[PDB]
Design a protein around this ligand. Sequence first.
Ligand SMILES: CN(C(=O)c1ccc([N+](=O)[O-])cc1C(F)(F)F)C1CCN(c2nnc(-c3ccnn3C)c3ccccc23)CC1
Ligand SMILES: CN(C(=O)c1ccc([N+](=O)[O-])cc1C(F)(F)F)C1CCN(c2nnc(-c3ccnn3C)c3ccccc23)CC1
Ligand SMILES: Cc1cc2nc3c(=O)[nH]c(=O)nc-3n(C[C@H](O)[C@H](O)[C@H](O)COP(=O)(O)O)c2cc1C
Ligand SMILES: Cc1cc2nc3c(=O)[nH]c(=O)nc-3n(C[C@H](O)[C@H](O)[C@H](O)COP(=O)(O)O)c2cc1C
Lengths: 645, 641
Amino acid sequence: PPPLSHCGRAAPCEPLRYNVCLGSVLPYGATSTLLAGDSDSQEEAHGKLVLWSGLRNAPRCWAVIQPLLCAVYMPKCENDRVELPSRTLCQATRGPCAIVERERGWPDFLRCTPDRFPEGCTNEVQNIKFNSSGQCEVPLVRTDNPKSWYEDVEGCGIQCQNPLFTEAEHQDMHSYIAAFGAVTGLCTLFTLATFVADWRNSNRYPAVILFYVNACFFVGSIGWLAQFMDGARREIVCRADGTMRLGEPTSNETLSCVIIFVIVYYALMAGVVWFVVLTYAWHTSFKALGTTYQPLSGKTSYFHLLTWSLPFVLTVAILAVAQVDGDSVSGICFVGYKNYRYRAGFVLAPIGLVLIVGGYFLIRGVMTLFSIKSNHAKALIVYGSTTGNTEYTAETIARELADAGYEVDSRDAASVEAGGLFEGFDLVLLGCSTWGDDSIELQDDFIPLFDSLEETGAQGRKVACFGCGDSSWEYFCGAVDAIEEKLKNLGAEIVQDGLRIDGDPRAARDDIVGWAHDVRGAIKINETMLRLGIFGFLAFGFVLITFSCHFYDFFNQAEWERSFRDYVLCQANVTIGLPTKQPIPDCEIKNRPSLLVEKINLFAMFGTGIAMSTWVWTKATLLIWRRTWCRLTGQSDDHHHHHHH
Amino acid sequence: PPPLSHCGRAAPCEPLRYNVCLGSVLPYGATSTLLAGDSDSQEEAHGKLVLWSGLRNAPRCWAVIQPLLCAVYMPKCENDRVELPSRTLCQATRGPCAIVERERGWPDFLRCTPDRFPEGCTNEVQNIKFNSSGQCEVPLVRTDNPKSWYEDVEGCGIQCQNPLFTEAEHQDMHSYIAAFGAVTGLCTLFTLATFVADWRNSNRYPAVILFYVNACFFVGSIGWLAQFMDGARREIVCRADGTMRLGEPTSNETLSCVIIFVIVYYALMAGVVWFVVLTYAWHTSFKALGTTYQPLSGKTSYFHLLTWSLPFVLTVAILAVAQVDGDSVSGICFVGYKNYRYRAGFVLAPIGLVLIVGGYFLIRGVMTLFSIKSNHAKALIVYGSTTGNTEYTAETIARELADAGYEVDSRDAASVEAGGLFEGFDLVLLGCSTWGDDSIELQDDFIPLFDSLEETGAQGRKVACFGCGDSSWEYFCGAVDAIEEKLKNLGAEIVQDGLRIDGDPRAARDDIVGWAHDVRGAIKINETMLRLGIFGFLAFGFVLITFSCHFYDFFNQAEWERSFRDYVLCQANVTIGLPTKQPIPDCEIKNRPSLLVEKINLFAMFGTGIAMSTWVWTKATLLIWRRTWCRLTGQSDDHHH
Ligand SMILES: CN(C(=O)c1ccc([N+](=O)[O-])cc1C(F)(F)F)C1CCN(c2nnc(-c3ccnn3C)c3ccccc23)CC1
Ligand SMILES: CN(C(=O)c1ccc([N+](=O)[O-])cc1C(F)(F)F)C1CCN(c2nnc(-c3ccnn3C)c3ccccc23)CC1
Ligand SMILES: Cc1cc2nc3c(=O)[nH]c(=O)nc-3n(C[C@H](O)[C@H](O)[C@H](O)COP(=O)(O)O)c2cc1C
Ligand SMILES: Cc1cc2nc3c(=O)[nH]c(=O)nc-3n(C[C@H](O)[C@H](O)[C@H](O)COP(=O)(O)O)c2cc1C
């Protein structure tokens, strides 16, 4: 067909000084510099192409901009007429070459004007094959998937390995996760094993909480350790093409990322909710005996309801807003690595709420603990002393109890009536020296009390004895033996082994102080519940450190994301306008996340699991597996244990 | 020949109003009352002869005084001359008629004066035969033998049958001696037979004392039972003539009395000396229990020296002073029946001496009973307690064992190492409470000990278990069951069934005290030493009763001997010359020996032998006569090989 008048412009033809345009040979021999507005000569047109060739980086732009640049700077001129490039050739660059309008801006002669670029014209460059493809820079990787391209740079995608941290820092962090993960995995596994080895007896509701607390940290450990199997880490953190996994759940990608996300986050949130249960349980167990509250042993349908539903609602909500992001250095998929606000919302806020609710019950339980001890602070000290040594011991014991918060009433046996003497005291300390040359004779003033000791109200009373004697005599502190014996026959609860002073009690003052310290120590305020309280405050400590680390990351990640963008886009090269002074990359990370804070975070996190596994580190546990061995050997034959077997 | 002038006196002859003198006819018809100084007429002379005829009793005197009294009161007067009695007729009465000079005294005309009774004259009464011999009253008997004559009554002797006791009382006493004698004879014979039946093992010197103690009461029984042989009693208690045997040995009399005396008295004194040996042996043996030291070892020789020589010296001394007296009611010859002082000297005094010496060693032995012993008992109490109930039980058991003399070491199972833990204890008491909801689980602190219980040294150890539990739980004190099952499988000796407390031990304190008491009991002690001590005090009791009875007889026989003399001399009558002055005979016993005291004496004597024969009344004796029948039949514990 003959050429159209509007698909050509009148221009004086000049012979081509260059027989090649951006690596491809030209079929014609005459050109024009009329289409190029910035160029007047072929030498200048060639010079501009060397500046435009800076777009090799971002290849899906480079592939479409090569034909357009050859159709404008080096076009076909034949019989004093230059061919115009079609509108379709110009419009094909607008999209993938957005970076041009974003950085420099399309010049007057390269904007798709119907005057400069007419509709339905033969391009001539359509016949010419441009085999040049381009390449992506070191922090980016070529990806075909459009859902993996990084911002403006179409054709390239952000690599899987986090570019803010070196390979040395990756190896260092993975070694740290392997160490804590394995210890936490093993310790919790031992605790879950001993509980199921005594499952029918260990289901008692005050301690069964520590079983589920360990169960969460056990499942959590599996999520963090999954990355160490051969090749798993890249199946969890890298996409099929090779770019890092962002905004999961995402289409046409394996579940490996969301599976590990659920295991880590759900076990994290189920664990912190079981913490609030532990703090609540210790708090309410006191008022079960003290005032009116009744045992909570049977709230299986209420604690399991809230501990397993709240993490479920949160995990489903994260998958819905699809903010599950993968990370090579942490080796797991978690909520809010790309966008810090989601990590703050679904992690920092729930951990903050469990600290104020859980912290409230620790305060309440302690206030209950201290009010009960003040209601059990009356103590009677009755002493029988001739030369004043037991009197001195009684008075020494009295100040130690008083310094500890008791209301001490010290009385001489010579001035007391036996009838209902011990009525109204939480503790009764009876002191008497030993006399009698051939035998055991009590100090004279204590005989009337000792003979009518049945009328004192010793039955069920918490008592302890003391007394002064001399090893130089036969039957050392025989009176202490006799009083302990009559009190024990009347039904009194002997708190500790009688304090028997040899010689002068002043030269044994700290022994008296030491005994009086231990005698209050033996005054139990639920031994079974006390341990539940240490573990409550212990867990709170580690949860508070975890919250602090997430707060640091929340308060600074806005700057690190900006620093991430500025570094990758600068490393992408693609500097079209002019060439830099040296080929040097001239690119830095102004600020990045702190790996220390993350190690402190994992220490507090995994550390809770290790600390809670020590709940079953008692003598009772040794007997649990003893039964398991003894009656695994006793069950090696037929049937099992019996009444006389 | 013509009659001599000095064999006759001038007197007026008067015809005889009485033709008979003391039962004999007179050849002459004229008499005189000149020779009789107390008589003036024939009626008065006849009257005096009736008073002199009171001497029919004491016939030795009556036979010789009849001719003299007829020659003085009714003499021959012929041609105004009365015949004088010869000196020989008068001198013949002086001796056998001593009673006359002892009671009234010979009158002036009956003393042998050469003036009143000249030498060599025809008596005339020499031709006259006096057939009258006289008599001996009921407690006396006529005896030819001079030695048997009793006191002043020559011609009579005290009968064999004791006149103070009736025939009914003799039969009653002989029946009592026959009963005890036979039982004591049989019982001791069985005991002597059993020691001989197994003489090698029973010849141990703490026990063989009881063999010789029985040997004495056996020989003694033979002496008391010998009287029951047909007519043996009268050969032992009566002399050949028929009078009771007094102050023997006596000439021309059988040994039957001294033979029975030796058998009874020697066996009595050998027995009471063997008692002092028994009291000494227990005293020294019980003292030497804390060591191997054997105290009696060389004393064996010295015991036989003392026990067999002292009775011999005494028996010989009694035969020397010859105070062996026979008695019909006791039926045996013994020392001091006639004279109480010899019975007191040779019986009461030695029995008194054996009581103070023998009593001393019984006291010394009870002093050893309450003295500190060299050997004490060691006991270990290991307890496993969570709420302190088994700890309380352990301490309650401890204080009870300690009150009994044990050295109790009470330890908590939580603070002990199982390795050689029971080493050095006589008794080990393990205590443990039961725990576990579905099964039997021991108190937590006892598990380490229970699992390494093989290393404690329980093999052959005497053990007993205890523990607290609650019936409200399925397996009541299952830990007590498990511990005594493992101890029994290791070879420990379970002393008693485990003390299993239901609920609070404080409300069952005396049950714990009671169990602890019974645990000590099942520990075997020296039953032979114990038993020797009981037989020592048993024998002392009976010896003390025997002494009491001999003391009664000693303190009163002086009166009974006086009563014996007064009654016998009364029954027989003498009356030398008295019109008796209207009297009442009233001849009776004022006081006699008590037969009750004698029965109490024999009961305590024979009773000692019966009590000491019980020494061989044990289960071992049944086995001794078991082996004896088999060994003599030839066969062993089945058939001989
Ligand atoms: C997110 N991020 C980035 O580098 C990052 C990635 C992509 C973009 N972007 O724009 O595409 C931006 C960024 C930036 F701006 F740098 F944040 C860091 C990754 C590493 N790191 C960790 N964070 N949490 C945990 C941890 C503790 C307890 N539980 N968990 C889950 C953790 C555990 C171990 C080791 C490290 C951890 C800190 C944040
Ligand atoms: C002696 N006498 C006379 O009657 C007696 C005889 C003669 C004259 N006299 O003057 O010629 C005086 C008296 C008189 F004065 F009455 F005593 C009694 C005889 C009987 N009797 C006994 N005596 N001992 C024992 C006995 C106990 C333990 N061992 N034995 C040896 C004994 C045992 C059984 C039964 C009786 C016994 C008491 C004394
Ligand atoms: C007569 C006498 C008997 C004594 N008996 C004993 C005794 O059996 N055991 C003992 O340990 N001390 C015994 N002692 C020592 C006293 O117990 C000792 O001096 C004590 O410190 C007195 O204390 P007091 O002032 O309370 O009476 C005895 C002292 C005396 C002088
Ligand atoms: C969990 C439990 C289990 C028990 N099991 C038993 C048992 O099997 N048999 C038994 O007789 N008592 C059983 N008891 C009761 C104790 O044996 C009882 O209270 C005892 O007095 C404890 O004594 P202690 O102070 O020596 O430990 C059990 C008590 C508890 C609380």
